């Protein structure tokens, strides 16, 4: 890479298809998860806050408590165990 | 149920392919195993497709091979009718063979090593550089095609 | 059907597009209510570089205040046709514009469930000339 910021090489993954453009629905920004649930991490290009580092987009972790309204999801980067602070807006229920 | 025979060695073959063969209980050239025809197994042989010879053998042939190259989970013991009868659910080799073919049991389940360590093909095989459709010995075979190989390596 | 289809005057905007005012006074008497400043956009050569800047005033008259005004304005104008909107409006003159439309216009001006008026329910240049011409004067 020519630079090493968090958004390096994120043009695709953090951009919306022309039609999904604009403010997202509030239903999923308010969804409630329970400790133990499996959730898919995917940043919503439309939602500014509650994001996590673009490198984890695609990960599927486990909800283990929360911090404020944001959730604390545990994942495994390669072989390293990591905890990720993320809001509902960027999480989906597995299955 | 297909008969799998490794015809190409490990040197230079992809590691993930080698592991697969290993998961199929074949760790040497000319070693053979019987595998059920399931989606999971199907995907496996496909990935192994270029270094093996497989096909559905005939009742007879399986019998000849079972008799000639089957072994207990441990030991020299010849697997003959008597052995089959005094150790398995069936009464004789034919009975075992049929059950295998109809995928009702497996060589392990009956206390037999999952591997039939065959002999080098008498008269030689068709080449390990081309597939069957090309006159080679690699890939899927005919029941008659697998039988010849298996019988040559009996 | 009619009654709710027949035209009506909705606001008459009287504005003096000066270039920098004392003019409000006359608009106040000519209409009958306070005028509003007219700020401008963009910086331009007519020493009009100031963005927020009084550069004229206007006055939007509704109901009687509008008629009682047109009952002298119109007479001071001759023109008609071509000088009419495609929506049945027209400006003459110091400017004096007359916005015309039919009974259910609020549907497009309210907050809740607002909706654009259907081309069919719009007012045509012709249907406009009729209404007005039919009120103390002549067309073309």
């Amino acid at each position: 890479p020519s630079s090493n910021g968090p958004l390096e090489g994120t043009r695709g993954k953090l951009k919306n298809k022309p039609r999904d453009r604009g403010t997202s629905p509030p239903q999923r920004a308010v969804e409630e998860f329970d400790d133990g649930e499996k959730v898919h991490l995917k940043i919503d290009p439309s939602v500014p806050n509650g994001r996590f580092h673009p490198r984890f987009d695609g990960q599927t972790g486990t909800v283990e408590g929360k911090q404020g309204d944001a959730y604390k999801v545990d994942i495994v980067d390669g072989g390293k165990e990591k905890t990720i602070i993320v809001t509902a807006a960027h999480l989906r229920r597995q299955e | 149920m297909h008969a799998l025979v490794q015809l190409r060695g490990e040197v230079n073959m992809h590691t993930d392919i080698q592991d697969t063969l290993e998961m199929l209980n074949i760790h040497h050239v000319n070693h053979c195993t019987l595998v059920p025809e399931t989606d999971a197994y199907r995907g496996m042989v496909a990935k192994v497709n270029d270094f093996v010879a497989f096909g559905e053998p005939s009742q007879e042939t399986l019998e000849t091979v079972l008799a000639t190259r089957a072994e207990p989970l441990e030991g020299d013991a010849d697997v003959d009718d008597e052995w089959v009868a005094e150790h398995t659910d069936y009464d004789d080799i034919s009975g075992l063979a049929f059950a295998l073919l109809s995928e009702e049991t497996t060589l392990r389940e009956q206390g037999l090593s999952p591997t039939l360590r065959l002999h080098p093909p008498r008269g030689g095989h068709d080449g390990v550089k081309h597939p069957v459709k090309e006159g080679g010995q690699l890939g899927k075979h005919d029941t008659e095609g697998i039988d010849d190989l298996l019988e040559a390596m009996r | 059907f009619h009654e709710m289809r027949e035209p009506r005057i909705e606001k008459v905007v009287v504005h003096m597009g000066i270039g920098h005012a004392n003019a409000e006074d006359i608009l106040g008497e000519i209409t009958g209510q306070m005028p509003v400043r007219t700020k401008a956009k963009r910086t331009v050569g007519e020493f009009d570089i100031r963005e927020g800047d009084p550069i004229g005033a206007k006055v939007t008259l509704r109901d009687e205040m509008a008629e009682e005004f047109l009952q002298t304005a119109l007479p001071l104008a001759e023109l008609a046709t071509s000088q009419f909107d495609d929506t049945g409006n027209f400006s003459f003159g110091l400017d004096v514009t007359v916005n015309l439309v039919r009974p259910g216009y609020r549907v497009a001006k309210r907050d809740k469930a607002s909706r654009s008026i259907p081309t069919k329910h719009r007012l045509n240049p012709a249907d406009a000339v009729a209404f007005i011409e039919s009120t103390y004067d002549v067309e073309v």
Binding site: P18, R19, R21, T23, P26, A29, V30 | - | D111, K112, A113
Partner: protein
């Protein structure tokens, strides 16, 4: 509409009925919403909760089914609003609902407004709602005094036939009084 790249608003935005930015802020509380809505002739008050396939209304009150309790006056005024609020508020309590936040939709937060009147009613019914007392009407106007005094400048009945000529903020008391004990559907 124009092309594959065109962006069509969410239905309820097209219909100019839901303010989604406000809705999201509303849902933040995690409490039931006290939906205060009006019509040219009536006033509605619902207690909505979030649901898998959409909102769930656990209790509601309409200015029309107000008569069902002895209302004999118009239903698009302040006294009406308050009462519908209190009515829905009560049915709410019955439902086991204890607190809510006020959703006034696309209406304006004007002081002494009917939506705030609705809010006052729901509060008195016993519902716990984040509010501000001095944004509410001064009780008398809630009662309908502003209208009684307006008919004082009579000369012609403010009410076409309807009931009374000089109107009744008292009829208001009689009703509130009624709703505060027993009766069906409460």
């Amino acid at each position: 509409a124009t092309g594959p790249r065109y962006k069509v608003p969410m239905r309820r935005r097209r219909e100019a009925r839901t303010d989604y930015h406000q809705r999201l802020r509303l849902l933040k509380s995690g409490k039931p919403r006290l939906v205060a809505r009006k019509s040219n002739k009536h006033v509605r008050a619902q207690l909505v909760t979030l649901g898998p396939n959409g909102d769930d209304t656990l209790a509601s009150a309409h200015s029309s089914d107000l008569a069902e309790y002895g209302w004999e006056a118009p239903t698009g005024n302040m006294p009406s609003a308050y009462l519908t609020g209190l009515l829905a508020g009560l049915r709410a309590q019955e439902a086991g609902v204890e607190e809510a936040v006020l959703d006034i939709g696309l209406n304006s937060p004007t002081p002494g407004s009917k939506v705030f009147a609705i809010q006052e009613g729901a509060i008195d019914a016993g519902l716990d709602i984040p509010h501000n007392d001095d944004v509410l009407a001064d009780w008398q106007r809630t009662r309908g005094a502003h209208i009684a005094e307006y008919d004082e400048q009579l000369e012609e009945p403010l009410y076409s036939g309807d009931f009374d000529a000089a109107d009744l903020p008292e009829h208001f008391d009689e009703l509130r009084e009624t709703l505060l004990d027993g009766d069906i559907e409460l």
